[PDB]
Amino acid sequence: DPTAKLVRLNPGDGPGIVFAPPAGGTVLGYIELARHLKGFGEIHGVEAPGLGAGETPVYPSFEEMVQFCSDSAAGVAGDGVYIGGHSLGGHIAFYLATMLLDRGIRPKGLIILDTPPRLGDIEETKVFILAMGIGGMLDQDRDALKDLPYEEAKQLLLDRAKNDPRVSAFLSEDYLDRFLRLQMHQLMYSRDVVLPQRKLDIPIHVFRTKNHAPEVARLFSAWENYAAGEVTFVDIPGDHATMLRAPHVSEVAQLLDRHCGLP
């Protein structure tokens, strides 16, 4: 019964991208990037099952999530279409791509946004996650959200979203609740389960920020372990959270355009 949902993130010429969602299952963290890209045609994201109103919430295993996302991406994926992802979305995207190849569908490449193949480590905990994750995605004062009761922090996010035409269509009180619950669930995925375990036979492009702790910075090169063909590393501005928001996302977009899009 349950399925993931393919969502169009932009309004012409160039390759496509299908983004896999990070923890929480939403595409909304890619909207700003999608709006800044100029070298791509169709940009989609896969939305996890169970985030819509009146739907049954779904808490998939990592493998189940990959399956949901593969099935959804398969409608548009193939020649001329990248798979991409940020944070846990990068691991999902890697495994999604391997599943498409196994089914005879070959994406143009895999775009990894600033995660190594080793996934990085993560009541007051609930509020901190809200503030640092979707609070970040929404350009919010993260320190102010932390100093708040969970329900009051949630209301500030809704106040910010409810008349923003980029997200007001779907980011309701119910959607936010479902996102936060699925996020907590997916934040418990085991690092050993999401680690790549085979080589991927399409090119990989890794876009990495340069303000990581050294112990994380030295883990990016391991993407080459999982590349049966080309792997390319591209430095981008910002840090892990702010690279997908203004002003850094415009430069991230320019670099994706240059390295992966249509000249």
Coordinates of C-alpha atoms in Angstrom, one line a residue, residues 171-258:
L171 CA 4.6 22.1 5.7
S172 CA 1.5 21.9 8.0
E173 CA 1.4 21.1 11.7
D174 CA 0.7 17.5 10.8
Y175 CA 3.6 17.3 8.3
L176 CA 6.0 18.8 10.8
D177 CA 5.0 16.2 13.4
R178 CA 5.4 13.4 11.0
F179 CA 8.7 14.7 9.8
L180 CA 10.1 15.0 13.4
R181 CA 9.0 11.5 14.3
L182 CA 10.4 9.9 11.1
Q183 CA 13.6 11.9 11.6
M184 CA 14.1 10.5 15.2
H185 CA 13.5 7.0 13.8
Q186 CA 16.0 7.4 10.9
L187 CA 18.6 9.0 13.2
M188 CA 18.8 5.6 14.9
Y189 CA 19.9 3.8 11.7
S190 CA 23.1 1.9 12.3
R191 CA 26.3 3.3 10.8
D192 CA 27.2 -0.3 9.8
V193 CA 23.9 -0.8 7.9
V194 CA 24.2 2.4 5.8
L195 CA 27.9 2.0 4.9
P196 CA 28.3 1.1 1.2
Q197 CA 29.2 -2.5 0.7
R198 CA 29.8 -2.8 -3.1
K199 CA 31.3 -0.7 -5.8
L200 CA 28.9 1.4 -7.9
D201 CA 29.4 1.3 -11.6
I202 CA 28.5 4.9 -12.5
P203 CA 30.6 8.0 -11.8
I204 CA 30.5 9.6 -8.3
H205 CA 30.8 13.3 -7.7
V206 CA 31.5 14.2 -4.0
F207 CA 30.9 17.9 -3.1
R208 CA 32.5 18.5 0.3
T209 CA 32.6 21.4 2.7
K210 CA 36.0 22.3 4.3
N211 CA 35.2 23.0 7.9
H212 CA 34.9 19.5 9.2
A213 CA 36.8 18.2 12.2
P214 CA 40.0 16.5 10.8
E215 CA 38.6 13.1 12.0
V216 CA 35.7 13.6 9.6
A217 CA 37.6 15.4 6.8
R218 CA 39.9 12.4 6.4
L219 CA 36.9 10.1 5.7
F220 CA 35.7 11.6 2.5
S221 CA 38.3 9.9 0.3
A222 CA 36.8 6.5 1.1
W223 CA 34.1 7.2 -1.5
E224 CA 36.8 5.8 -3.9
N225 CA 36.4 2.4 -2.1
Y226 CA 32.9 2.3 -3.6
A227 CA 33.5 3.6 -7.1
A228 CA 33.9 1.1 -9.9
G229 CA 34.6 4.0 -12.2
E230 CA 35.3 7.7 -11.9
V231 CA 35.1 9.5 -8.6
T232 CA 35.6 13.3 -8.4
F233 CA 35.9 15.5 -5.3
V234 CA 34.8 19.1 -5.4
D235 CA 35.3 21.6 -2.5
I236 CA 32.3 23.7 -1.7
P237 CA 31.8 26.6 0.7
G238 CA 29.8 26.6 3.9
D239 CA 29.6 23.9 6.4
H240 CA 27.4 20.8 6.6
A241 CA 24.2 22.6 7.5
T242 CA 24.6 25.9 5.9
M243 CA 25.8 24.6 2.5
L244 CA 22.1 24.1 1.5
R245 CA 21.1 27.6 2.5
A246 CA 21.8 31.1 1.3
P247 CA 24.4 32.5 0.6
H248 CA 26.5 29.3 0.2
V249 CA 23.9 27.3 -1.7
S250 CA 24.3 29.6 -4.7
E251 CA 27.9 28.7 -5.0
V252 CA 27.2 25.0 -4.4
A253 CA 24.7 25.2 -7.2
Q254 CA 27.2 26.9 -9.5
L255 CA 29.7 24.1 -8.8
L256 CA 27.1 21.4 -9.5
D257 CA 26.3 23.2 -12.7
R258 CA 29.9 23.3 -13.7

